[PDB]
C-alpha cells in the first residue's frame, strides 16, 4: 500500500503515505511504466470543491468551524443553482501555492510558501491581460532581485471560449526559418514566430529577438502586444576566464515565466495563469544553448576552446557544456540577477523532501525532471528514490490553442 | 495510431508505438495511482505455462512455430514436469534464452551487442572447486588480453529441495573495503560487508585501496569456499590523465572486466541462481559512479584540489570540472592500455540504433530511462530526449538477495 523510498547515498528509508490522497490516475499500469513520457457533471465538481475547501479550512487550522461549514454551504448552493462556483481571493492564494507545492517536476519547491498571487479574474479584454502581464513582469523582475509570482486570469466557463496566452513563456526569442531550412534564433519557436508575423508583427532578424505576446480573450482572435524593451531584463553572457566567449554575442533573459499551463483548483480551471520564479542555470547553459534542436552551440564553443572535435572520447562535448554553464552563472552573478546552480538547487530540494516527509508524509517527485541534465549523479537527488503521483490543486499541461 | 503506448523522441520529432509490451507476463511496481519507476528494488501450474511460453519463443526464433518438432518438444517438457516436477533445456535453448535475457534487460545500454554473446554451458558443474575452474576460464576468455568478449557461464539450475549454486560476490572482480579505527573505510565502502565475510572464512586481508577480493563460491548445501584469483588473470589499468601529469601520481586504478555474478537468470520458469556474465565498461561507470559517488571512492574533492578549483562554493562548478577530467582519465588510460572501453556518447548512440533495430524486429524495446541516461552529461546524449517504456519480459535477469 505504502511504498518504501530509499536514499542510496545515505542508506535512509522513508514511507510515502501522501500518495494515498491522490485521486487522479497517471499513465503507468502494472504491465508497463510510462514515467519517462513528457505527455502521456455537478456531483464530481461538487466533491472536488468540497475536498478543496476542506484543504483550505484545515490549512488555517479552522476545520469544522462555523466559517468552514457555511463556506461548504455557499459552494453547494452555487453549484446546484449554476453548475459552477467562484473562489475567494484567500482561497485562490492558498490553491496556487499548493499547486506549486504539488508539482512533481519542479526542483524549486523549497520556495513554495513564498508566492506573490495577482488576482486578475476581473480581466475582460486582451488589452487588460496585457497590462496585468506587464505588471507581473515588472514585479517579478524587480531590477534583478527576482520574486516568485503568478497572475491568475478568469476561469474556464461552460458557456464559452478560454482566456489563453498563446506564448508558452512570457519571454522567448524568435526563430526565423531561413531560405535553406536552417533557423536563425530559437528553433523551438519557429511556429509561434510565424503566427506573430501572420498577425502583423514586423520581425527582426536577430538570434535574440524577444517575441511579442499573442493574447486571446474568449471567442476572439488572439491579439498582438509588443513588450516594452525596458521591461524585459536580459543578461549578456561572458566567461570568467575565456575572453573570446563574450564575443560570441550570446545572451539570455532574466525571467523564466511559464504561460501555457492550466491551473486547476477545487475543480475550477484557469487556462491563463502565467507564473515565474528564477532560473536554475543548467536550463539555459545545457538545454537552451546546447540541445541539438535548440541553439546548438556546443560544437562552436568546443572549437573556440581548440578542443579535438573528431572523436567523442576527448569528451569535448562535456568540456564545453561545463564552460557554457559556468559562463551562465558568472554572467548572471555579474549582472546581479537571481539564479541558482544545480548543486545548490538539488540540495535545497533534498531539504524540501525532508520538510514534506514531516509535513504530509511524502512528496510527489518526477526523478527524470528533478535530476539535472549535466552531472546527474554528482547531485544528491540522483541517489534518492522518488514516488510520482498527481495531487490537486495541480498545474496541467495544455496543448497550443491553434 | 492504436491502443499501445505512443513513444516520442523530442530531439528528432519522431514517433513510434510500443506493441511488444503486450507480451509482458509479469507486473512491475507502478499502478495508475503512482509511478515507482525510479526505485532500484521494487509449482506445477505455474512452471508449465512459463515453459510452454519459452518453448514457443524458441520455436518462433528458429521459424518452426506450430511444427511437429515444436509440438513434440512441448509434449516432452510436460511429461518431464509431470514425472520430475522440473525439466531441462536443450543446449541451443539455453543459448537462445541467455541471449534473450540480455536482450530483455531494460537497464542495459549495451544491448546493441546482444546477439554476440559467448555462452559457456557449465550445467555439469558439481563442486565449488569446479565453479572456480569455470569462472577462471570465463575470465581468461572474456578478458582476452584486453580485447574483451561478452560472455556468460551458466551453472546448474535450482532443483526441488536441494541447495543453490551461488557466487557470494556481486561481481567476479571487486576491491576490498576495510573498516578503519576512525570509522572511515580504506578501499571500496561498497564492499565492506563481503570483505568482512572473506576474512571470517579465512582470507588474509591486504591493506591497500585496491585489493582484489577473493571469491566465495557455494555449491549445493555446503558453506561457501574461498578462492583467490591468480593475479595474472585479473587485468587492471592504472589511471593517468592525458595533460594533467599529476593525475598518475594519485595511484588510482580500475579492473578491465565488469562481470556481474549475483543475478538470477530465469528461463521458461527455470532458475539459474549462478550465471555470471561480463561485457566491457562504459567509462562513466568507473569515472563517475565508482570514483566520484560520495559513498564510494569519493575522490571529487581531492581531484578538484589538485586542479586548484574553488571547492568552497557550488557555483564554481568544481564538481562538474573534476568529474569531466576523471572521466577523461579513465578513457585515456583504457585506450592507452588497449583495453576495450566505450564512452557514454558512443554507447548511447549505439543504443539509439538498437532501439531502431528492435522497433523493426519486435515492435519495441523495454528500457529504464533513469538507468540508460548516463550520470554525467545526460542531455548531451541522444537517449535523454527519447521516451522509453519499461516492462518485464522473460527470459530475464533478476536481482538476488545476498545469500548471507
Ligand atoms: C523560485 C524558483 C524556481 C526554480 C529555481 C524552479 C525550478 C524549476 C525547474 C528547473 C523546472 C524544470 C524546467 C524545465 O525543464 O522545463 C521546473 C518546473 C516546474 N515548476 Fe518550478 N521553479 C521555480 C519556481 C516555480 C514557481 C513559482 C512555480 C509555480 C507557481 C513553479 C511550478 C513549476 C511547474 C508547474 C513545473 C513543470 C513545468 C512543465 O511541465 O513544463 N516553479 N521548476
Ligand atoms: C557488451 C558490453 C556491455 C555494455 C557496454 C553494457 C553496459 C551496461 C551498463 C552501463 C549498465 C548499468 C550498470 C550499472 O550502472 O550498474 C548495464 C546493466 C546491465 N547489463 Fe549490460 N552492458 C554490456 C553487456 C552486458 C551483458 C553481456 C549482459 C548479460 C548477458 C548484460 C546485462 C545487463 C544487466 C542484467 C544489467 C543490469 C544490472 C543490474 O541491475 O545491476 N550487459 N549494462
Ligand atoms: C510538451 C511539454 C510538456 C510540458 N509539461 N512542458 C513543456 C515545456 C518544456 C519542458 N522543458 C523544456 C520546455 O519548457 C521550457 C520552459 N521551462 C521553464 C522556464 C523554466 C523555469 C525555470 C525556473 C522556474 C520556472 Cl517557474 C520555470 C512542454
Ligand atoms: C541493489 C541492487 C540492485 C540491482 N539491480 N543492481 C545492483 C548493482 C548496482 C547497480 N548499479 C551500481 C551497482 O552495480 C555496479 C556494477 N555494475 C556492472 C559493472 C557494470 C557493467 C558494465 C558493463 C557490462 C556489464 Cl555485464 C556490467 C544493486
Ligand atoms: C524523454 C524525457 O522524459 C524528456 O527528455 C525529459 C527528461 N527530463 C527533463 N527534465 C527537465 N527538467 N526538463 C525537461 O524538459 C526534461 N525532458
Ligand atoms: C534512485 C535511483 O533510481 C538510483 O540512484 C539509480 C539511478 N540510475 C542509475 N543508473 C545506473 N545505470 N546505475 C545505477 O546504479 C543507477 N542508480
Ligand atoms: Zn511508472
Swiss-Prot record, chain A:
Zn(2+) binds at residues 28, 33. This is Nitric oxide synthase 3. (6R)-L-erythro-5,6,7,8-tetrahydrobiopterin binds at residues 36, 368-369, 382. Belongs to the NOS family. It is found in: Cell membrane; Membrane, Caveola; Cytoplasm, Cytoskeleton; Golgi apparatus. The gene is NOS3. Produces nitric oxide (NO) which is implicated in vascular smooth muscle relaxation through a cGMP-mediated signal transduction pathway. NO mediates vascular endothelial growth factor (VEGF)-induced angiogenesis in coronary vessels and promotes blood clotting through the activation of platelets. Heme b binds at residues 106, 397.
Amino acid at each position: 500500500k505504502f511504498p518504501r523510498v530509499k536514499n542510496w547515498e545515505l542508506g535512509s528509508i522513508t514511507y510515502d503515505t501522501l500518495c494515498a490522497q491522490s485521486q487522479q490516475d497517471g499513465p503507468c499500469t502494472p504491465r508497463r511504466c510510462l514515467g519517462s513520457l513528457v505527455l502521456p457533471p455537478a456531483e464530481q465538481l461538487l466533491s472536488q470543491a468540497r475536498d478543496f475547501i476542506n484543504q483550505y479550512y484545515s490549512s488555517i487550522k479552522r476545520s469544522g468551524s462555523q466559517a468552514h461549514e457555511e463556506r461548504l454551504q455557499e459552494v453547494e448552493a452555487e453549484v446546484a443553482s449554476t453548475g459552477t462556483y467562484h473562489l475567494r481571493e484567500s482561497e485562490l492564494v492558498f490553491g496556487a501555492k499548493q499547486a506549486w507545492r504539488n508539482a512533481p517536476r519542479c526542483v524549486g519547491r523549497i520556495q513554495w510558501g513564498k508566492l506573490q498571487v495577482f488576482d486578475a479574474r476581473d480581466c475582460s479584454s486582451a488589452q487588460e491581460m496585457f497590462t496585468y502581464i506587464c505588471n507581473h513582469i515588472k514585479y517579478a523582475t524587480n531590477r534583478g532581485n527576482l520574486r516568485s509570482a503568478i497572475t491568475v486570469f478568469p476561469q474556464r466557463a461552460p458557456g464559452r471560449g478560454d482566456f489563453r496566452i498563446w506564448n508558452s513563456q512570457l519571454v522567448r526569442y524568435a526563430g526565423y526559418r531561413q531560405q535553406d531550412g536552417s533557423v536563425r534564433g530559437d528553433p523551438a519557436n519557429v511556429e509561434i514566430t510565424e503566427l506573430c508575423i501572420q498577425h502583423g508583427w514586423t520581425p527582426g532578424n536577430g538570434r535574440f529577438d524577444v517575441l511579442p505576446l499573442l493574447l486571446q480573450a474568449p471567442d476572439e482572435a488572439p491579439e498582438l502586444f509588443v513588450l516594452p524593451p525596458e521591461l524585459v531584463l536580459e543578461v549578456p553572457l561572458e566567461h570568467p576566464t575565456l575572453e573570446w566567449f563574450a564575443a560570441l554575442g550570446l545572451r539570455w533573459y532574466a525571467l523564466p515565466a511559464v504561460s501555457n499551463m492550466l491551473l486547476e483548483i477545487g475543480g475550477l480551471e484557469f487556462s491563463a495563469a502565467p507564473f515565474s520564479g528564477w532560473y536554475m542555470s543548467t536550463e539555459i547553459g545545457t538545454r537552451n544553448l546546447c540541445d541539438p534542436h535548440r541553439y546548438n552551440i556546443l560544437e562552436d564553443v568546443a572549437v573556440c576552446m581548440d578542443l579535438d572535435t573528431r572523436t567523442t572520447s576527448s569528451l569535448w562535448k562535456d568540456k564545453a557544456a561545463v564552460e557554457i554553464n559556468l559562463a551562465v552563472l558568472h554572467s548572471f552573478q555579474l549582472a546581479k540577477v537571481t539564479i541558482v546552480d544545480h548543486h545548490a538547487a538539488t540540495v535545497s530540494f533534498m531539504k524540501h523532501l525532508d520538510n514534506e516527509q514531516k509535513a504530509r508524509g511524502g512528496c510527489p517527485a518526477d526523478w527524470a525532471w528533478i535530476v539535472p541534465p549535466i552531472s546527474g549523479s554528482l547531485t544528491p537527488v540522483f541517489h534518492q528514490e522518488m514516488v510520482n503521483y498527481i495531487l490537486s490543486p495541480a498545474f496541467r499541461y495544455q496543448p497550443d490553442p491553434w
